[PDB]
């Protein structure tokens, strides 16, 4: 339990009830009141270092407005660039910055991307527009009018989606501040239907963390311990790390649920993280307000059932970071020059373990994942025609089990972040997963 990680939990748990408070707010004091509190806070726990998260958005604006029709590669390139620079200072000499720095870099770099990439949208939409001749009407997800530098200040210095997220798209701002009648979206119930199982889930975390700590494996003395007490013991560590992201991120939901951020209509069909993909009326009175029925499905960025009890591994990872998940599939999948699926995974798991740091770690896991996604590919799309159903469902519960172990077994990869201990704690399994990966394919 560090003290960092402390702060960061009390900011969580009080960013709920400032999103009371700044629910009832009209749509110019709910925006300026929302960035001042976002400036207030990102002061207070990172100190001088949020000069760098200034540079980075005033170079965003300044290359949207000075290449407006190749933007989005510009802004790319340039965040993606001045990352390596944010994480090189030790390099440099220069003081070096809390993770918390380095949380709001992350969730920076992901919204400025995205601003980058709808301002290309829009650029493009104008500039088609009047090419054509034709004026279409308002299409559904496309910005009003390029945004101003103070606009985009307060876009991104909101307290919600700034330390933890999750991401959202400028356009789910505009249409949070442009939200008519704020008192008829219901907050307290789909808070409450949200935040049933957070402390559960906390004491289960914490349960985990005091009996099987992370640090043993670090010591020399675990591994004298017979293989299957290291088989008992792989399985707690990745429980812990999932409890722990669960907690925080259910708590990040329901303290963005409280400012009524994200919300919109069922019948708009949005999808999560990406906002509505169906046009749907604004409306009228306050009493037709309160009677449709509203989803904060957006914000939702961990789906605790479907990732604890999926089948396939790709499922899982789809229901893992739904939000950030989108936006790679957007902006770099869609995007990526290769045309090979097995490449543009390849591409988008190394700019994803570029996002998250530089640490061998992180290169080692999301390269090792590849290799047993392939070989899933191939033994399901092979097998999974030839079984009875009864084997249909033996295949299930083995192939959960296996999935499973296989998180685990990567996870620890994933968290010890050095690779001397990762390579040791690995062998000393004998690389089991490896290689019946390779049986597997």
């Not at 339990?1 to 629910?23: A, N, R």
């Not at 601003?115 to 493009?124: F, G, I, K, N, Y």
């Not at 210095?157 to 008829?184: H, K, N, S």
């Amino acid at each position: 339990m560090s003290p960092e990680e402390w702060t960061y939990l009390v900011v969580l748990l009080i960013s709920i009830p400032i999103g009371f408070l700044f629910k009832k707010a009209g749509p110019g004091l709910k925006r300026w009141g929302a960035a001042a509190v976002g400036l207030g806070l990102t002061l207070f726990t990172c100190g001088p270092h949020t000069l760098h998260s200034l540079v980075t958005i005033l170079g965003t604006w300044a290359l949207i407005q000075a290449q407006p029709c190749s933007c989005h590669a510009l802004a790319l390139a340039w965040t993606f660039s001045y990352l390596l620079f944010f994480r090189a200072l030790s390099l440099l000499g220069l003081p070096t910055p809390t993770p918390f720095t380095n949380a709001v870099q992350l969730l920076l770099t992901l919204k400025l991307v995205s601003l980058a990439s709808e301002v290309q949208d829009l650029h493009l939409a104008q500039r088609k527009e009047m090419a054509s001749g034709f004026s279409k009407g308002p299409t559904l997800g496309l910005l009003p009018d390029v945004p101003s530098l103070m606009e985009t200040l307060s876009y991104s210095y909101c307290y919600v989606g700034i330390m933890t997220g999750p991401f959202f798209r400028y356009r789910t701002y505009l249409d949070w501040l442009e939200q008519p009648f704020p008192g008829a979206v219901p907050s307290l119930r789909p808070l409450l239907r949200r935040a049933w199982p957070a402390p559960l889930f906390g004491l289960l975390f914490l349960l985990s963390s005091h009996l099987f700590p992370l640090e043993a494996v670090r010591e020399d003395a675990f591994y004298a311990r017979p293989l299957p007490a290291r088989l008992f013991y792989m399985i707690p560590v990745f429980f812990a790390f999932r409890m722990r992201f669960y907690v925080a991120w259910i708590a990040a939901e329901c303290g963005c649920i409280a400012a009524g951020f994200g919300a919109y209509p069922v019948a708009a069909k949005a999808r999560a993280g990406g906002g509505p993909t169906l046009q749907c009326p604004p409306p009228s009175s306050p009493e037709k307000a309160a009677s449709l029925e509203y989803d904060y499905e957006t914000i939702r960025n961990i789906d605790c059932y479907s990732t604890d009890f999926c089948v396939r591994v790709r499922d899982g990872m789809r229901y893992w970071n739904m939000t950030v998940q989108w936006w790679l599939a957007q902006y770099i999948y869609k995007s990526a020059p290769a045309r090979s699926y097995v490449l543009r995974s390849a591409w988008t798991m190394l700019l994803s373990a570029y996002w998250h740091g530089l640490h061998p770690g992180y290169y080692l896991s999301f390269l090792t994942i590849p290799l047993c996604l392939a070989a899933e590919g191939r033994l399901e799309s092979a097998l999974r025609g030839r079984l009875s159903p009864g084997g249909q469902k033996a295949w299930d519960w083995v192939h959960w089990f296996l999935k499973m172990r296989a998180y685990d077994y990567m996870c620890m990869g994933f968290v010890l972040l050095s690779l001397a201990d990762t390579l040791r704690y690995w062998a000393s399994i004998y690389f089991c997963i490896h290689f019946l990966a390779l049986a597997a394919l």
